[PDB]
């Protein structure tokens, strides 16, 4: 629908399943995550318009989320080689760490930026505030996490409820609709 090459970013199963259901509905989807082994493949094609791209960004090993922040400037540089060619009009970031990447990108480029929230503290809170303030839309997966965000992080920004679940077709349809809403708001 609406506008073509979209990028989902998950530095660290939410994104993999979303992008495949999105592409089933017709979106051209490139999903980016980090490499965690030097024998990892660079591109995994799932369908003619859906693939996962694994970027070398920090050590070629499994790094847990609580140690990933320092790898993000490298993830931004690796991603910028793909964004330099594909020019993604929409980028959808997953978890606050990928959102830092989205935040850095949005400071340099003009794209529709959506972010999905999920539930060191000093860094996370400042970054989560920056994302809420500058992203076009932040997705929460339950009222309880929306309640937490508004209580403990910030009241700023636009949040939308797309609930946790195992029906990825349904989720993708709701996400797709948001994408198109964002794109039409160009006026």
Residue numbers in the entry: 25 to 36, 53 to 159, 174 to 241
Q: Would you copy out the relevant sentences from the publication that reported this structure?
A:
SPS catalyzes sucrose-6-phosphate (S6P) synthesis by using UDP-glucose and fructose-6-phosphate. All SPSs identified so far belong to the GT-B type glucosyltransferase family and contain two Rossmann-type folds. The N-terminal fold is called the A-domain and the C-terminal fold is called the B-domain. Thermosynechococcus elongatus SPS is a kind of sucrose-phosphate synthase (EC 2.4.1.14).
In order to study the function of TeSPS A- and B- domains, we generated three truncated proteins. In the second one, the last α6 helix was switched to the C-terminus of the first one, with this truncated protein having the entire A-domain. All three truncated proteins were easily purified from E.coli. However, only the second protein (residues 27–220 and 406–426) could be crystallized and resolved to 1.92 Å with structural statistics provided in Table 1. The A-domain could be merged perfectly with the A-domain of the full-length enzyme with an RMSD of 1.3 Å. Unlike the first truncated protein, this one has the α6 helix at the C-terminus, implying that the α6 helix in this position is important for domain folding. However, in the second truncated protein, electron densities of two loops (loop 1, residues 37-52, and loop 2, residues 160–173) were relatively poor and thus their structures could not be solved. In the full-length enzyme, loop 1 is key to binding UDP and loop 2 is close to S6P. In apo-TeSPS, these loops are likely flexible and appear to be important for enzyme-substrate binding. In the absence of UDP binding, loop 1 was crystallographically invisible in the A-domain structure. MD analysis of the A-domain shows that RMSD values of loop 1 and loop 2 are higher than those in the full-length enzyme.
